[PDB]
Structure 1
Amino acid sequence: GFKQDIATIRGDLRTYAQDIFLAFLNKYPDERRYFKNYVGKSDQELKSMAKFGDHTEKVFNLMMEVADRATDCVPLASDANTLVQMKQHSSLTTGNFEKLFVALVEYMRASGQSFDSQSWDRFGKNLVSALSSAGMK
């Protein structure tokens, strides 16, 4: 289920974080603009780079903490509020996060592993509706 998925992801956080983030960028290439440091670089160029790995690690670590504090895939308001009020997210809209979760769910469905893909879809929808409530456009 969802809790075991969080354990799987956490067990190999840097690998899953990199692979899902690159799935996102490659599915929605206009999103790369938000990451000036990653423009014009292959997946392997990025996987060799400690700072790309460090970035993806820190993002997915917080995503797993939000997921683990959720009840029935409903995230905490306080956690949606952290994500809206981070300086780093000042330019973003809920569509940026929707696209990340579509990529994550597609990644999980394509994986061959027994991820609870539908729970991640519901988590992402519930997180988008919480970001909107906390004032994201």
Structure 2
Amino acid sequence: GFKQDIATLRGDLRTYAQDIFLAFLNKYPDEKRNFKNFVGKSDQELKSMAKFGDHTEKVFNLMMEVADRATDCVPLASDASTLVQMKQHSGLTTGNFEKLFVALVEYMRASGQSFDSQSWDRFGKNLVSALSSAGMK
């Protein structure tokens, strides 16, 4: 289930973080509007870029903590507030986060592994709801 999935992703986090983030950017190309340094680059080129690996690792490090602190896939309000008040997130709306988790769930469903895809779908929806509650447009 959800708790084991957190362990699975953490066990190979640089690989999963990069692959899931690439699935997101390739499914939703216009989201690169938020990541200009990643434009005009193939997956293999991004995986050799220092700032790409550092960004994806830091994002998924924090995502896994938020997941780990959740109860029944409901994140802490404090974690939602942190994500909304982050200066790096100033321009963002909830649709951006929805798309990230649609891509993550699709990646899990397409993998050969027994991820608990429905729990991550719920987690994404509850996080979007919590982001909205905390003031994200």
Confirm or deny a common fold (TM above 0.5): yes
Separation in structure 2 between the aligned mates of residue 8 and residue 49 of structure 1, nearest angstrom: 25
Runs of 4 or more above 6 Å deviation: none
1:70 Cα offset (Å): 0.1
Separation in structure 2 between the aligned mates of residue 42 and residue 125 of structure 1, nearest angstrom: 30
Q: TM-score, normalised by structure 2?
A: 0.99
- Which residue of structure 2 lines up, in the alignment, with residue 73 of structure 1? 73
1:49 Cα offset (Å): 1.4
Structure 2 gaps of 5+ residues are none
Residue-pair matches, total: 137
Identity of aligned pairs, percent?
96
Q: TM-score, normalised by structure 1?
A: 0.99
Separation in structure 1 between the aligned mates of residue 133 and residue 33 of structure 2, nearest angstrom: 26
Corresponding position: 1:37 with 2:46: no
1:34 Cα offset (Å): 0.3
Structure 1 gaps of 5+ residues are none
Separation in structure 1 between the aligned mates of residue 31 and residue 60 of structure 2, nearest angstrom: 17
In terms of mean alpha carbon deviation, does 13-22 or 48-57 score higher? 48-57
Separation in structure 2 between the aligned mates of residue 94 and residue 70 of structure 1, nearest angstrom: 19
Question: For residues 44-74 of structure 1, what are the alpha-carbon distances to aligned partners after superposition, in whole Å with 9 as ceiling and x for unaligned?
Answer: 0001112211100000000000000000000
Separation in structure 2 between the aligned mates of residue 38 and residue 48 of structure 1, nearest angstrom: 11
Separation in structure 2 between the aligned mates of residue 51 and residue 15 of structure 1, nearest angstrom: 15
